[PDB]
Write an enzyme that holds these catalytic residues in place. Structure first.
Site, PDB file in Angstrom:
ATOM      1  N   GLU A 168       0.816  -1.212   0.000  1.00 59.19           N
ATOM      2  CA  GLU A 168       0.000   0.000   0.000  1.00 59.19           C
ATOM      3  C   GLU A 168       0.849   1.261   0.000  1.00 59.19           C
ATOM      4  OE1 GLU A 168      -2.585   0.231   3.334  1.00 59.19           O
ATOM      5  OE2 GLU A 168      -3.400   2.192   2.818  1.00 59.19           O
ATOM      6  N   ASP A 226      -2.934  -2.845   4.558  1.00 61.43           N
ATOM      7  CA  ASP A 226      -3.469  -2.621   5.902  1.00 61.43           C
ATOM      8  C   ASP A 226      -4.860  -3.208   6.058  1.00 61.43           C
ATOM      9  OD1 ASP A 226      -1.373  -1.176   7.163  1.00 61.43           O
ATOM     10  OD2 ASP A 226      -2.020   0.683   6.234  1.00 61.43           O
ATOM     11  N   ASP A 239      -7.524  -2.296   7.688  1.00 55.75           N
ATOM     12  CA  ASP A 239      -8.306  -1.226   8.288  1.00 55.75           C
ATOM     13  C   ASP A 239      -9.304  -0.753   7.236  1.00 55.75           C
ATOM     14  OD1 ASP A 239      -9.203   0.613  10.088  1.00 55.75           O
ATOM     15  OD2 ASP A 239      -7.358   1.783  10.209  1.00 55.75           O
ATOM     16  N   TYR A 243      -3.495  31.418  22.082  1.00 51.45           N
ATOM     17  CA  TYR A 243      -3.806  32.573  22.902  1.00 51.45           C
ATOM     18  C   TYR A 243      -5.178  32.531  23.544  1.00 51.45           C
ATOM     19  CZ  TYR A 243       0.109  34.479  20.384  1.00 51.45           C
ATOM     20  OH  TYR A 243       1.339  34.680  19.833  1.00 51.45           O
TER      21      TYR A 243
END
Lengths: 747, 747
Positions: B24, B97, B99, B358
């Site tokens: 992949e 993978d 997933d 901030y």
């Protein structure tokens, strides 16, 4: 003009009553729009009758927009009051963040642009700024805060008082931090913020030094660190409302220029930059209770939370991944994390690591407990990010970690790691008295001399390290089989990735004409590159690429030689740059920082151990007399406090004796003896049993014998703590050896 | 070809023994290089004699690289065993993978590309994959784990056993998660991973539905949610090592297609997407103890740590900032955070918020405690990410939060928030028995006949909301002064920013020819735009832009009218898409989900309150008889356990009675009565006093009267909990009113 609102009376007859507000970005324009349009609330304040906004975002183009909206002439000089009477606005005001990017860079370039082209308008008061409250202090009941315009004013105000428990202190580093009522009370006193820049007598050469390029005056200005404004300079500024250009260029812009260097160059004590030190101090904290595996993005979320890391996550995630990599020829030779996953290989430089969603990480916890001991991290000076503890100014390790692991920077900084087994020899020749070369103490510490050698690394490396006069070179290996005429490359030189090396041979057209095909069947750790070359080529690549005494005929054909030259630029512990020139004087500048911390550790734990013995003698007296005192008879808590006072128990603070975290020894002796009765009162009804009493009695005996040994240690020659710094050398050596035999997995 | 290593026997005489590994990305290539070059460790495994790697990163170009390295012909068909005998590799293997991005998208497109052009090679076994262990279970002492290739196999294995305390369960969702010894044990059994795709009979139309565009077959396939593989399908796959294309396209690719819609479309119960629900569940956790302010990047670090948020920080930071904005016409009308700082104004759409370094943020804590009560959040179905507990599947609030605040998506989703004071009327007409319009209980829900108005918002809006048949339109206001002929715009219509509106008039060349200049002096909340227009223009802009009965002559000149049309697409609680068509049926699909949670809350706290009363009766008996039992006499802890057993104290678990966190009522009654003696043993030596005993005795009396009231509440008409859901309507109404009078600051 992009992002320009003009005043209703600019250009006209009162076009010297109108001022121009030059905001830094796009939130500041909404703050100024909030404040100019108060209307009915300010019958006297500013509005869009005599004020007009503009942006500065992108520094050109916006500077040409400023020239267009003011009517400035590049060819005039504005010496007389009728040349500058036909400008379209009276003055320019800069509404800029009061941080390092705001005051150090935007306002500095605005001053340098008005100084290079019109150096008369700074004198006659055309360039201004408006100065906002940095720190406020709110006390309960009162609405009015106590506003401070510098950090030294708050530091002076804080020493006079005693109880700082009912005060809350807010910092305002950027202009988007001001809340609604705070802006509405700032712009009712608008004229009491606008300060005017005066072109100082010495500002000319300082503008030329800072905004003029990298030269020798700048490179010897930045080697001393930022000196803050004193009380007198501050009082003069707040009296006449005029700021010299020299004080702004000497505080704000110098802090910005040193802000960058501290991001790229390491401190010479620990060898770490500012971001890596946030990562190490966060990794000691999250893996303290249970050393489980967190993912890289979850540990990144921890470090950006608890250690005040504000530079986005991609730099954070790649620094966590670079902290864990353990291939041959990587940056960290002694990584502080264990890489549970796939973090990268030497073939493309460690940049083929997996996604941070899939990879885990956890501490070393056996290396890191013997290198950075946790009984010294209470004693180091910390940094304070908006009044919160963040990280030390510098860790002081047990061995000089700046000359021990590789590191480079694309300021010139390149370090080639040094051999372990001969920095241990000279550290243990400094410390051990009976070591027969303890004459390194004076010959080599007063002035710089040489008694023990210190050569480069030679680990995870199968090439050769050869010295020619003043440099070291790193060579590779190869094997030739003339039956089919194929050269097999077996080892690249130090720190050279393999994909870049193959494309280095690919892009050389002068020696691609001797090879046919090149392909690599190397594995994750070793090198195996096959060079398919053309026929009748073995005899002519030796007669074009000449046999030098350094680089032989096949080595310079295949580029199998590297140069080890090193740029030893570091950072002072107080601020500023050191240009070292030898690997000896880094550790000779490290050794006076370690033994002082040993002496300070021994004295502080001497004091805490005194009052631990006191409180546990008291609690073991209570759990003997508690069957007859029978405090369950009594009605309340202060009554039991009075009755325990009548029987002669000392009052003590129990949170400060069991855990003196950052308190000094003077604070340990002043307010750690008066307190209350909670060390007795909040017992467990499990410490009353007999085996618990036995444990606590032998614990008090252990602490008494330990006190005897600490008082023995504080009068040892050569210095206090020599017999506790050799055993930590042995512990860190044993952990390094146990990590080099496991491929840094610590099974 | 980019990133292609060829096998040593490809193309030759055994060019049908060679396979091609299509990784992949770039970490997978290093995993395959780690595994192919074992050499001496695998005398039988794969190597670079019959396997060659390639990449797929970038999906074209790499597909043309695949065609080039295999020798595929676009014009052949590969039906006979001699056409496909002259390919250069035997099969293609995908090392992808496991997933949603790996199996759902890369492998699906690879299958669709081999299906659209060569649908015979899927049949004859040319397209393969290699399947890796998803979940492993390690038990201490043993080296061998128990590897599972699906999640349902682990779910089946986990029900058979009892003690899951000495097991550690690791999930491996992506191919970079495999440690070095785990890869070395995976590629010794390399042939037991390679599975072969068979072109199923029904795969043809499924390939056309998924990889063919947005149509009606796809839009009615995705409305039902993912159905997992059962035991029989799984056993057939692991027996013959063949995967149908239909099962892969029906599990993995459908889970991917529904994973991207759950990121863009909200659940209809709470009105929140998946990322906003992680943010809300993390914000309830960090501001639980001390609700002090904490900056946006620090809270982002918290949410990416504890709630498993893995999509980078910029989406996280902009969703936190969008969760806190409270200008007129913003997305959240009822924000869950308070914005201490400058978070954006209506003039450029809320995209001018300050930097997250901030600005601070903190909870509402008075709105959010009466809308999402914390005694219901233990009872909701949670999501589990790699075995960790992350966030609920859906919150169930007190009022239907999907029709109450604005929201849109650049799938078509656009919601216009509904009026508060007439959704409260119909919720309290559903609940209150004596309310004289309780005939909404059947005549409007079960029979669908409306009886209660529900009109749009009209808050923070000074225009007009007018209805024309079936749509609502939102108008603006203006004022004209014909003495100088200037039009002043005072109110834009709903959700229209001002910078975009000004540039909308700027880019219209057809009506710029009637104006001279346009500038805005608006306040952060109100609108004040001055339109400087040319002379002799007031009479001709009324005679070109026609007076329509909807949009009058100055409104369509100045674009002061907006259309309120709404796309009500949501997500089911189990999975899939609902296409609602009215704002009534969202709340009618919300009301059956609330009262069930009231009944479940009352029963669970009934049970926990029973055993709380039991343990505190026992501890108040101990602190009376403790003066005479005198357990300090005894030697150890189990001896005191035996002696407390002799005197008739019940053994109990103290960690589960004081805090039943997620245990069900059956778990509360099974293993919460056997335990030990620590509720007595770990006392405080402060609970023994008389005032503490008085507090605890009145506490037991309060819990007894509360038990009486809970048993009264569980038999109330119309349903259990009607007299506890009206008071929470009153509490959330009081908090909303107290927030609309403070500009959502809650002073």
């Amino acid at each position: 003009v992009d992002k320009y609102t003009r005043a209703r009376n600019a250009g006209g007859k009162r076009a010297q009553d109108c001022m121009l507000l030059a905001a830094e970005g796009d939130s500041a324009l909404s703050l100024l729009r909030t404040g100019l349009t108060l209307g009915k609330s300010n019958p006297s304040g500013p509005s869009f009758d005599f004020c007009g906004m503009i942006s500065l975002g992108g520094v050109n183009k916006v500077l040409q927009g400023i020239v267009q909206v003011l009517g400035l002439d590049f060819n005039c000089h504005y010496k007389t009051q009728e040349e500058r009477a036909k400008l379209r606005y009276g003055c320019i005001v800069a509404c800029v963040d009061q941080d390092l990017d705001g005051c150090g860079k935007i306002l500095g370039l605005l001053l340098a642009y008005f100084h290079l082209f019109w150096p008369q308008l700074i004198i006659h008061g055309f360039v201004k700024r408006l100065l906002t409250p940095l720190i406020r202090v709110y006390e309960k009941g009162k609405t009015m805060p106590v506003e401070f315009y510098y950090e030294q004013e708050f530091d002076a105000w804080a020493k006079k008082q005693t109880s700082l428990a009912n005060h809350t202190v807010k910092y305002y580093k950027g202009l988007a931090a001001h809340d609604t009522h705070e802006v509405k009370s700032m712009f009712k006193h608008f004229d009491n913020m606008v300060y005017t820049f005066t072109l100082d007598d010495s500002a000319k050469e300082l503008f030329h030094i800072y905004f003029g390029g990298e030269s020798e005056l700048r490179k010897r200005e930045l080697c001393t660190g930022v000196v803050p404004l004193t009380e007198t300079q501050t009082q003069s500024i707040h009296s006449v409302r005029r700021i010299p250009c020299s004080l702004h260029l000497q505080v704000d812009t110098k802090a910005y220029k040193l802000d960058a260097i501290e991001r790229q160059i390491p401190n010479f004590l620990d060898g770490m930059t500012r971001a890596r030190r946030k990562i190490l101090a966060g990794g000691v904290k999250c893996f303290a209770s249970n050393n489980r595996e967190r993912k890289v993005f979850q540990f990144g979320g921890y470090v950006a939370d608890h250690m005040f890391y504000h530079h986005g996550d991609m730099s954070l995630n790649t620094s966590i991944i670079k902290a864990a990599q353990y291939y041959p020829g990587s940056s960290h030779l002694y990584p502080v994390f264990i890489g549970i996953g796939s973090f990268g290989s030497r073939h493309l430089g460690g940049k083929d690591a997996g996604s941070p969603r899939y990879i885990s990480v956890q501490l070393a916890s056996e290396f890191i407990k013997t290198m950075f001991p946790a009984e010294d991290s209470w004693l180091l000076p910390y940094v304070f990010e908006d009044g919160q503890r963040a990280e030390p100014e510098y860790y002081v390790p047990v061995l000089p970690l700046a000359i021990m692991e590789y590191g480079a920077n694309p300021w010139k900084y390149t370090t080639w790691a040094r051999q372990l087994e001969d920095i241990l020899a000279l550290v243990r020749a400094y410390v051990d008295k009976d070591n027969p070369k303890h004459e390194l103490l004076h010959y080599a510490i007063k002035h710089k001399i040489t008694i023990l050698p210190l050569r480069p690394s030679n680990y995870n490396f199968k090439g050769h390290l050869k010295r020619f006069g003043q440099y070291y070179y790193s060579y590779g290996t190869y094997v030739i089989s003339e039956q089919r005429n194929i050269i097999t490359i077996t080892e690249l030189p130090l720190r050279v990735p393999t994909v870049a090396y193959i494309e280095s041979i690919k892009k050389s057209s002068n020696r691609m004409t001797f090879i046919e095909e090149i392909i690599d069947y190397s594995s994750s750790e070793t090198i195996e590159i096959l060079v398919k070359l053309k026929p009748n080529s073995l005899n002519r690549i030796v007669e074009e690429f000449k046999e030098t005494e350094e680089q032989d005929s096949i080595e310079n054909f295949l580029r199998l030689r590297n140069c080890l030259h090193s740029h030893l630029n570091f950072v002072k512990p107080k601020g500023g740059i050191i240009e070292f020139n030898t690997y000896y004087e880094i550790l000779y500048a490290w050794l006076p920082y370690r033994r002082e911390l040993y002496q300070k550790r021994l004295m502080r734990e001497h004091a805490v151990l005194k009052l631990r013995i006191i409180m546990e003698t008291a609690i073991v007296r209570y759990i003997n007399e508690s069957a007859e005192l029978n405090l369950s008879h009594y009605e309340d808590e202060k009554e039991a406090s009075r009755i325990l006072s009548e029987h002669g128990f000392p009052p003590l603070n129990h949170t400060l004796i069991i855990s003196p975290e950052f308190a000094s020894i003077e604070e340990l002796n002043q307010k750690a003896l008066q307190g209350c009765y909670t060390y007795i009162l909040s017992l467990q009804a499990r410490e009353l049993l007999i085996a618990a009493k036995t444990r606590r009695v032998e614990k008090i005996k252990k602490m008494q014998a330990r006190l005897d040994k600490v008082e023995q240690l504080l009068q040892e020659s050569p210095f206090p703590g020599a017999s506790v710094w050799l055993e930590e050398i042995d512990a860190v050596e044993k952990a390094i050896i146990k990590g080099r035999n496991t491929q840094w997995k610590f099974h």
